[PDB]
Design a protein around this ligand. Structure first.
Ligand SMILES: COC(=O)[C@H]1C[C@H](OCCN)[C@@H](O[C@H]2O[C@H](CO)[C@@H](O)[C@H](O)[C@@H]2O)C[C@@H]1C(=O)OC
Ligand code: CA
Ligand code: CA
Ligand code: CA
Ligand code: CL
Ligand code: CL
Ligand code: CL
Length: 131
């Protein structure tokens, strides 16, 4: 189950770290085009792994998490709620909704809420067995 050219493997999934930039909704579409999903994080170690990729590349990167539907209620693009323990991953002072910020990104060593219509890099996730 190797990952394809210029994907990244971790714990049985393949991740695509984009080299172009898209707004949040277009990032969701780009992942669906390749049979993947704008990344939904399911564990601490997956968070630590993805956060470090984004931190060391100095790339502000979308993940599949928003509070577009109900301000302050964050939910992943697969419909799962943000668990309270995962709220540890917000950067200090986030989420702050400054000017209305409804989409989550990796920013430095944790997460930031930012404007969904900003173009950022993105990460898709797909099982390695499905390639
Ligand atoms: C509409 O929001 C703004 O005018 C500002 C708010 C923040 O200014 C504080 C000085 N850094 C900036 O917002 C960025 O950084 C924040 C963390 O410091 C973060 O929570 C925000 O999501 C955003 O990434 C700058 C911002 C602005 O309009 O200028 C870029
Ligand atoms: Ca809002
Ligand atoms: Ca918000
Ligand atoms: Ca913010
Ligand atoms: Cl790309
Ligand atoms: Cl593109
Ligand atoms: Cl999706």
């Amino acid at each position: 189950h190797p990952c394809p050219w210029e994907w990244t493997f971790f714990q049985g999934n393949c991740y695509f770290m984009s080299n172009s930039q898209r707004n949040w909704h277009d990032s969701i579409t780009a992942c669906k085009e390749v049979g993947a999903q704008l990344v939904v994080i399911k564990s601490a170690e997956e968070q630590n792994f993805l956060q470090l990729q984004s931190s060391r590349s100095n790339r502000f990167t979308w993940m599949g998490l928003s509070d577009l539907n109900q301000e302050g209620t964050w939910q992943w693009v697969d419909g799962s709620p943000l668990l309270p323990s995962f709220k540890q991953y917000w950067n200090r002072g986030e989420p702050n909704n400054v000017g209305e910020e409804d989409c989550a990104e990796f920013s430095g060593n944790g997460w930031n809420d930012d404007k969904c219509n900003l173009a950022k890099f993105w990460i898709c996730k797909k099982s390695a067995a499905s390639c």
